[PDB]
Design a protein around this ligand. Structure first.
Ligand SMILES: Nc1ncnc2c1ncn2[C@@H]1O[C@H](COP(=O)(O)OP(=O)(O)OP(=O)(O)O)[C@@H](O)[C@H]1O
Ligand SMILES: Nc1ncnc2c1ncn2[C@@H]1O[C@H](COP(=O)(O)OP(=O)(O)OP(=O)(O)O)[C@@H](O)[C@H]1O
Lengths: 693, 192, 297
């Protein structure tokens, strides 16, 4: 095995024993963490690699003090990676705490929430988890150079909520998955930095003296790389056709898959692991790669080829930016909040390199093409593009095809023939688990991208996180339907509802984080991943009771389209559910409008009071009154509106007479009149009754 | 070269219903006073004139789609309430826009389902301006004769919706013809 | 160097990609195009008003206050949020902004007070199809229009010799009765203009500094672009569209795509633009205006 693969395998599994120690039930768990993991990884033939066993068994200080390991070995790198990732009585039943409550505990510290109110863990659960991981290591897992991604996938599948540390005196909020993953990434960066820099006596380099330990911690060893997608909000919103909804699901997925394939391809260039991707979502991406001249030259070269390709295909609609700024180990360990300083520096460099995107020769090259081309794509507003059959260009027709395939098939493959044009001379098509399996046994250089499917274990397992929900597929016809399937609802006016939401307090959350005590790279990674999981899984389950279709979900943007009533109800419900998930630490800013059917969805797109007072009190009163008393349709309510909108006392006296003439229960009339007499209550009343129609 | 301005006012003999919202009527989203889009005027004149006869109708409005290209020669502009009507209605305390109630009879069933429609008040006055661009000297008399014929047909027809049902009849008054660019005499031209 | 005030009183459609898009200001390309077509229609000569005149983009104004585009200067903080939401900076506070004297709360107040118009969609149909005779769908379509408050509008920046300015004033007198936007013949886009001098705008336009703020849409000529981009903060904007009376088929004639810097870019090496030709397979040349109008601070 290549020493790098040995290093990742050791690093990811150094603290594997902690779960079993916390298990307690089994006869293995009687001894300390390191040796425990040692005999446990020796139980399986595939993981019988001796060096990985050593890395696991010698991942802390006391063991290494007597470890008599060779002057060069990956174990020391693993030690340092765990240290940088990070009186000592560990409680085996410690539950994982949500970081979100800690994020805004400075303004209002509320009872800290714990995962599974005062929830406590049971050692039986740990026994069950150990049996599950024994099963995986026994049948599902096997060590090959290409299986490391599968190992990562199973680790994420199992450990994503078992706490990493269980110190009673420490504010535990790191899952073992996070700590292990960041350890793997950091260790890989260390290995590249030391090897390229022509140092081999790593024991002497770092283990020798504590002064050198702080010294290497201080040396600029890491590089923090950030990527930004230029024009998503424009290119996604040039849709006006009748099949608009099908494309939007296909277009957001197209940009998402672009970002995913480009980041994966980058990580392939770096000969590096997938654990190195700290955050993806929206048009952003964050990586922690090795700080080597080799790394920098590769990044620059790939940037050049990348910019070439996008200029070749869209030339203004989509562009990508690269930026990186040096960082050291001392920075990541949250010494003096300099983590936030470097985070802002990399953000600033990314945001000012976008100013200069085109060199001279490129800008000249653009302006002189008297090239014979056809005219704008109907579905996709682009002059430069050339249409074909039925007035559609190639890109949007492939978008239509993959949209057709989206609802039925769950797996997407990265293949060299495929359907949709993709950065690195590649194409994406759709597959099922069985032909994906055959592709795996076809030893083809493929990357299966899945639709929120765990326990796949198929080749390069990539449980891509995405919310693809559509109520139109819940009808008698499984085939995807047009926008009219939601317009034609008879329970109210035949219109459409649209909601957009952004976390208002997000810039500080990723930047400021938890101040002065928890701004570690580990905890930022945990925060980012938890936000990603919420905005990429929970929405899909929440939407199941609404006639709404998920369009753009991920990052901090939420885009749902459907019936007017269902959109409002789902917006309120998701607002409440999010307030639960962030424990009322993060809020939502949203706006909902009403538009007629088949309007260009491009232009379709360009809290407590509303629930308690309007929807719950006045709306229910009005609904009960209008249901009990007949003959009072939109005409009577519209006369109500004419009297209420024109805020004059003459209208109020007229409304008094109108309620005298109306045949409701006197309570309804009195309440309505007295609501109309207050400005706030009259506005709430008009809003509710407008909702009625 | 010269430009000719046609300016005046139009009255609704019976109520008008353009109704872009539909049952609302077109308004300005802030002033809320109703208008008359120039597209309605242009389209009704073009339909009536074409149906009164394809070179002259091509010449006035311009098609420029049939392999031969003609620039439009007569430009219509939108309309707004006259100040006179606003003053008059404010003094007399008259609502700007009425709301007529209607029904429909189901055969074999004879149960009526109601209907609500919004209608511009009778007797209002709108202000309109036409711009004519004389590009051929020897054609102005014929073109203005044709536009007079179009006005004549429009006076005897309807604008907007439900015209056969009894709304949209209009009338033209206070029309003057003034040259504003160039040196073409516009005193021998008439539009009634 | 005069400015030209514009008040509209009728909705205007200005357009980016389709008719149902609405836009507030217009670029120097369409402005010069309108001036040139009006000149040709009037039959006077184009040589005078081709290679002497410099036109700046249109910018909005309110009751008594004028506006300019946001400079793309690197303000070193970190909010980067309230300022990203700002699009136009009032003239009274321009030099304050370029010296980093604008506070976040003042920026929020400016964003609050910046109401100078609203957007609308009017739906329209077309019964020219078989509908008139046989069962055929009426075809609905929408146009994007934008309206001003009674005390708002757009204004120009123009400069050149006095004779060219007189010719420009004559042409604008002619032009106030054609349109300045999209569906000119469908009832949109007539204006009244007025010539005004502003003491504050004058002082701003004749300042002296080291940087430069581009107020038009320009592209450097081939041999000067290399030195132009030594230290530049800019964004490119694609400009395409069809052409008026170049060959038989309008739907076969389409101008070549062109790219030019936006109206807020900052440069260190001043360059002179040119009226680039964007024609091919045509009977008469078609022009696009790319010539800068700098303000030095
Ligand atoms: N695949 C996608 N489909 C639709 N919307 C998306 C997609 N990815 C991201 N978005 C959302 O669209 C928003 C607008 O993107 P925009 O074009 O402004 O670029 P950005 O990634 O925010 O960066 P910048 O504006 O600095 O270039 C993003 O912030 C994100 O929330
Ligand atoms: N799950 C996540 N993990 C890490 N970073 C994220 C995540 N989701 C979004 N972000 C980042 O946080 C940033 C927030 O900036 P953005 O302008 O989009 O929202 P905002 O500043 O909160 O807007 P507003 O304050 O107006 O609501 C984005 O640039 C985005 O890259």
């Amino acid at each position: 095995m290549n020493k790098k693969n040995i290093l990742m395998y050791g690093s990811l599994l150094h603290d594997i024993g902690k779960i079993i120690y916390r298990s307690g039930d089994h006869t293995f768990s009687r001894g300390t963490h390191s040796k425990l993991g040692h005999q446990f990884l020796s139980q399986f033939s595939e993981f019988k690699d001796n060096e990985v066993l050593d890395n696991v068994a010698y991942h802390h200080y006391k063991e290494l003090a007597k470890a008599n390991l060779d002057n060069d070995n990956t174990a020391y790198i693993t030690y340092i990676a765990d240290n940088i990732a990070s009186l000592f009585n560990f409680d085996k039943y410690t539950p994982l705490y949500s970081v979100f409550n800690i994020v805004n505990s400075e303004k209002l510290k509320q009872t800290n929430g714990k995962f599974k109110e005062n929830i406590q863990y049971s050692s039986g659960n740990y026994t069950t988890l150990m049996k599950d991981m024994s099963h995986d290591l026994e049948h599902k897992l096997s060590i090959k150079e290409g299986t490391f991604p599968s190992l990562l996938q199973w680790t994420e599948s199992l450990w994503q909520y078992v706490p990493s540390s269980t110190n009673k005196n420490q504010l535990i909020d790191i899952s073992l998955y996070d700590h292990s993953r960041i350890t793997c990434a950091i260790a890989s960066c260390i290995f590249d930095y030391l090897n390229e820099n022509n140092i081999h006596n790593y024991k002497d380099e770092l283990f020798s003296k504590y002064e050198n330990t702080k010294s290497f911690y201080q040396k600029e060893a890491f590089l923090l790389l950030s990527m930004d997608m230029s024009g998503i909000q424009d290119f996604i919103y040039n849709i006006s056709g009748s099949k608009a909804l099908k494309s939007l699901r296909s277009r957001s997925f197209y940009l998402e898959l672009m970002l995913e394939v480009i980041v994966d391809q980058l990580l392939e260039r770096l000969e590096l692991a997938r654990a190195n991707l700290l955050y993806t979502g929206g048009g952003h991406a964050y990586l922690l790669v090795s700080n080597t001249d080799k790394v920098k030259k590769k990044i620059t070269q790939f940037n050049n080829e990348l910019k070439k390709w996008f200029m070749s295909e869209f030339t203004t609609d989509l562009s990508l930016s690269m930026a990186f700024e040096k960082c050291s180990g001392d920075d990541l360990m949250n010494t003096s909040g300099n983590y936030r300083t470097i985070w802002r520096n990399v953000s600033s460099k990314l945001s000012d390199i976008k100013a200069h995107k085109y060199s001279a020769e490129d800008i000249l090259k653009l302006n002189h093409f008297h090239s014979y081309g056809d005219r704008e794509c109907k579905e996709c507003l682009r002059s430069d593009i050339d249409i074909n059959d039925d007035g559609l260009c190639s890109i949007c027709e492939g978008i239509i095809n993959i949209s057709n395939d989206l609802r039925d098939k769950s797996f997407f493959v990265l293949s060299e023939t495929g359907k949709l044009k993709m950065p690195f001379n590649k194409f994406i098509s759709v597959i099922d688990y069985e032909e994906a399996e055959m592709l795996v046994q076809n030893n083809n250089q493929v990357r299966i991208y899945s639709k929120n499917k765990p326990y796949i274990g198929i080749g390069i397992s990539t449980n891509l996180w995405m919310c693809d929900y559509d109520y139109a597929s819940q009808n008698q016809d499984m085939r995807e339907k047009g926008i009219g399937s939601y317009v034609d609802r008879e329970e109210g006016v035949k219109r459409l509802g649209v909601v957009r939401a952004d976390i208002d307090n997000l810039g500080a959350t990723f930047i400021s984080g938890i101040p002065e005590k928890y701004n570690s790279i580990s905890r930022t990674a945990t925060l980012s991943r938890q936000l990603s999981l919420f905005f990429k899984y929970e929405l899909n389950h929440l939407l199941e009771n609404y006639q709404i279709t998920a369009i753009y979900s991920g990052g901090d943007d939420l885009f749902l389209i459907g019936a007017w009533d269902d959109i409002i109800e789902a917006s309120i419900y998701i607002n409440d559910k999010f307030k639960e998930f962030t424990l009322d630490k993060l809020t939502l800013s949203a706006g909902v409008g009403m538009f007629s059917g088949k309007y260009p969805v491009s232009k379709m797109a360009f809290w407590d009071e509303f629930k308690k007072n309007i929807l719950e009190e006045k709306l229910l009163v009005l609904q009960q009154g209008f249901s009990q008393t007949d003959e009072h349709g939109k005409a009577f309510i519209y006369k109500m509106l004419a009297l209420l909108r024109n805020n004059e006392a003459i209208n109020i006296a007229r409304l008094a007479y109108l309620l005298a003439r109306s045949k409701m229960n006197e309570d309804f009339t009195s309440k309505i009149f007295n609501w109309a007499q207050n400005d706030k209550d009259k506005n709430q009343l008009i809003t509710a009754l407008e909702y009625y129609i | 070269y010269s430009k000719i301005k046609i300016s005046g006012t139009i009255e609704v003999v019976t109520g008008l219903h353009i109704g872009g919202g539909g049952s609302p009527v077109v308004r300005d989203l802030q002033t809320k006073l109703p208008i008359i889009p120039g597209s309605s005027i242009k389209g009704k004149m073009r339909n009536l004139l074409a149906k009164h006869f394809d070179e002259r109708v091509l010449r006035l409005f311009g098609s420029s789609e049939k392999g031969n290209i003609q620039r439009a020669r007569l430009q219509i502009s939108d309309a707004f309430f006259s100040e006179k009507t606003k003053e008059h209605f404010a003094q007399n305390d008259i609502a700007y826009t009425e709301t007529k109630f209607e029904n429909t009879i189901n055969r074999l069933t004879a149960v009526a389902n109601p209907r609500q429609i919004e209608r511009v008040t009778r007797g209002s006055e709108f202000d309109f301006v036409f711009i004519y661009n004389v590009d051929e000297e020897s054609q102005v008399e014929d073109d203005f004769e044709n536009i007079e014929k179009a006005i004549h047909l429009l006076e005897n027809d309807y604008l907007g919706g439900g015209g056969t049902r009894g709304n949209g009849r209009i009338q033209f008054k206070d029309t003057n013809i003034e040259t504003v660019v160039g040196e073409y005499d516009s005193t021998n031209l008439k539009i009634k | 160097t005069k400015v030209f005030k514009l008040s509209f009183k009728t909705p205007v459609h200005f357009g980016k990609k389709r008719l149902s898009d609405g836009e507030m200001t217009i670029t120097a390309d369409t402005l010069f195009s309108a001036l040139f077509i009006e000149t040709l229609q009037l039959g006077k000569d184009t040589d005078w008003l081709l290679n002497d005149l410099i036109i700046s983009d249109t910018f909005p104004y309110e009751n008594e206050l004028y506006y300019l585009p946001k400079p793309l200067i690197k303000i070193d903080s970190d909010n980067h949020k309230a300022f990203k939401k700002l699009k136009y900076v009032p003239v009274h506070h321009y030099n304050q902004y370029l010296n980093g004297e604008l506070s976040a709360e003042d920026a929020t107040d400016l964003n609050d007070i910046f109401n100078i118009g609203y957007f609308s969609l009017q739906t329209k149909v077309s019964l020219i199809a078989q509908e008139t005779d046989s069962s055929a769908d009426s075809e609905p379509y929408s146009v994007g229009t934008f309206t001003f408050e009674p005390e708002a509008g757009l204004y120009f920046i123009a400069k050149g010799s006095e004779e060219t300015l007189d010719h420009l004033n004559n042409i604008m007198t002619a032009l106030q009765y054609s349109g300045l936007g999209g569906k000119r013949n469908a009832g949109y886009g007539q204006f009244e203009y007025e010539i005004i001098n502003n003491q504050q705008l004058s002082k701003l336009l004749n300042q002296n500094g080291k940087h430069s703020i581009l107020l038009s849409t320009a592209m450097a000529k081939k041999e000067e672009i290399e030195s132009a981009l030594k230290e530049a903060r800019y964004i490119l904007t694609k400009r395409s569209g069809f052409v008026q009376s170049t060959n038989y088929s309008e739907m076969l004639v389409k101008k070549s795509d062109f790219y030019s810097f936006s109206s807020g870019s900052v440069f260190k090496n001043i360059f002179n633009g040119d009226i680039f030709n964007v024609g091919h397979n045509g009977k008469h040349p078609v022009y696009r205006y790319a010539k800068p109008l700098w303000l030095e601070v």
